[PDB]
């Protein structure tokens, strides 16, 4: 009774995902090159736009559900391409101002809101992560829920891109840094410390 997009972008771990208005999906000029990736490209993409099934047909390959996979799988590669878009950014960035994405673990980043990202644009070769515009390094997602989202679906360059477009939105460097202290003062180069992997 309500859109597929708003449904999938409302499940666990899909908090990072932004609803990709079809203005961009219908414009098949974008879906380009995808067909030679996801299986059952069509049947799937229909399911995604909310068209009509193909219902009395057989089910040896259990197609009736194997497509469900393609639907979600595919909607990923699109969502990635999308968030790139000068507009898809506004959507993402909308979720950032309220970090539906999460904050930076480092304590000196002072609860810095981060944006999703992918270590690799290949499915299964990595999952989503979390670039921090402050520390400028990545961290694995907090809660165990956002743990099965493929990084590929968010684009290795999305974050970096976002600031190319919105340089003003690039945070300031940490006010202060973590200062290690024992009984009263700093610990000079522990270079030696390391040196003991020979006798360990």
């Amino acid at each position: 009774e309500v859109s597929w997009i708003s449904w999938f972008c409302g499940l666990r771990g899909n908090e990072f995902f932004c609803e990709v208005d079809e203005d961009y999906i219908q414009d098949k000029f974008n879906l380009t090159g995808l067909n030679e990736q996801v299986p059952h490209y069509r049947q799937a993409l229909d399911m995604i736009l909310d068209l009509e099934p193909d219902e009395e047909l057989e089910d040896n390959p259990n197609q009736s559900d194997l497509i469900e996979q393609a639907a979600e799988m595919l909607y990923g590669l699109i969502h990635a391409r999308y968030i790139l878009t000068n507009r898809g950014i506004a959507q993402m960035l909308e979720k950032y101002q309220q970090g539906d994405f999460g904050y930076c673990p480092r304590v000196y980043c002072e609860n810095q809101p981060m944006l999703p990202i992918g270590l690799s644009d290949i499915p299964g070769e990595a999952m989503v992560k979390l670039y921090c515009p402050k520390c400028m390094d990545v961290y694995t997602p907090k809660s165990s829920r956002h743990h099965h989202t493929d990084g590929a679906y968010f684009g290795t360059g999305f974050p970096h891109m976002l600031f190319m477009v919105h340089p003003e939105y690039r945070p300031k460097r940490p006010a202060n840094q973590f200062v290690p202290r024992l009984y009263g003062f700093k610990i000079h180069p522990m270079a030696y410390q390391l040196q003991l992997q020979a006798a360990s």
């Binding site: 024992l182 009984y183 009263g184 003062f185 700093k186 610990i187 000079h188 522990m190 030696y192 410390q193």
Partner: protein, 335 residues
């Protein structure tokens, strides 16, 4: 009445004729340095009242050492600073670098000069007659001097003597235990490491003197030339005065307490027994006879004696026949 008094043969009144300040550290004030002046590096050793690392005075990059006094009373902390200061500049008397504190924890931190102290596993594993004699002499030098200033160590032991064998330099440490000797004054007998404690301590005789340092010393030499670390190896505190007796004999012991009518906690009563006074020739295995000399023995036997008044003193030990060869080469004793 009960236990019999005793006193000090030499330097008997140093502190007496010295100012209230020199001895009353309880009312002593510290001139702290700056924490930031030096930063830590690598950990050296642990204590019970402190932890020791190797740091560096950033103001010059000079390898320094840092003891960090763990929370105690303002007492045991001050009676280690004042002492340390009066002695510093002394011969072999470890120089007191400086005092700082954790700006926040308000935690205390001592600083001394650095010393490439060769660990003992090496030391009492490759020393020769002279070496010992030599070193044993340098130690006395310290004791004599601190005794000169009217101060006793109460914690002499291999653990507390830094030895730079390469640089034949040697310094004493841990002045936390040392205190001042005042006539007729009772002190705490829960001092010194077990294996290095004196009889007065093993029999709650609370009015001892510098002579205490001597015992603990004798112990060191034994373990050394004989090669038995330590030579008086007991389990509890009572089994110490027990091992000790299985060597100097039981007799001279009882005669001791008698000479001083002391309350001998009846516990010993069934732990000591009856023992002859072994002739040191009993600890001369093939592997140590080259450290074992007659003057050696002799010298020793003149420290390891129950009565604290009978032990040789600084100056005295220093003039014994064991040392001759050593002090001779002291072309100008005092210069």
């Amino acid at each position: 009445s009960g236990p019999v008094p005793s006193r000090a043969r030499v330097y008997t009144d140093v502190n007496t004729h010295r100012p209230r300040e020199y001895w009353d550290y309880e009312s002593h004030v510290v001139e702290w340095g700056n924490q930031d002046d030096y930063q830590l590096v690598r950990k050296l050793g642990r204590g019970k009242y402190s932890e020791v690392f190797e740091a560096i005075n950033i103001t010059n990059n000079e390898k320094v050492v840092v003891k960090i006094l763990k929370p105690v009373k303002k007492k045991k902390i001050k009676r280690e600073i004042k002492i340390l200061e009066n002695l510093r500049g002394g011969p072999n008397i470890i120089t007191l670098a400086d005092i700082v504190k954790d700006p926040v924890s308000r935690t205390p931190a001592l600083v001394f000069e650095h010393v490439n102290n060769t660990d003992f596993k090496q030391l009492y594993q490759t020393l020769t007659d002279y070496d010992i004699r030599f070193y044993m002499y340098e130690i006395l030098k310290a004791l004599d001097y601190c005794h000169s200033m009217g101060i006793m160590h109460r914690d002499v032991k291999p653990h507390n003597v830094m030895i730079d064998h390469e640089h034949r330099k040697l310094r004493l440490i841990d002045w936390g235990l040392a205190e001042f000797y005042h006539p007729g004054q009772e002190y705490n007998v829960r001092v010194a490491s077990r294996y290095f404690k004196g009889p007065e301590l093993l029999v709650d005789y609370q009015m001892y003197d510098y002579s205490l340092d001597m015992w603990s010393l004798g112990c060191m030499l034994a373990s050394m030339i004989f090669r038995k670390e330590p030579f008086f190896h007991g389990h509890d505190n009572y089994d110490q005065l027990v091992r000790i007796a299985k060597v100097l004999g039981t007799e001279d012991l009882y005669d001791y307490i008698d000479k001083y009518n002391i309350e001998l906690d009846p516990r010993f009563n069934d732990i000591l027994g009856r023992h002859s006074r072994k002739r040191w020739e009993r600890f001369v295995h093939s592997e140590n006879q080259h450290l074992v000399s007659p003057e050696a023995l002799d010298f020793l036997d003149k420290l390891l004696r129950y009565d604290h008044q009978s032990r040789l003193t600084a100056r005295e030990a220093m003039e014994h026949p064991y040392f001759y060869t050593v002090v001779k080469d002291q072309a100008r004793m005092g210069s």
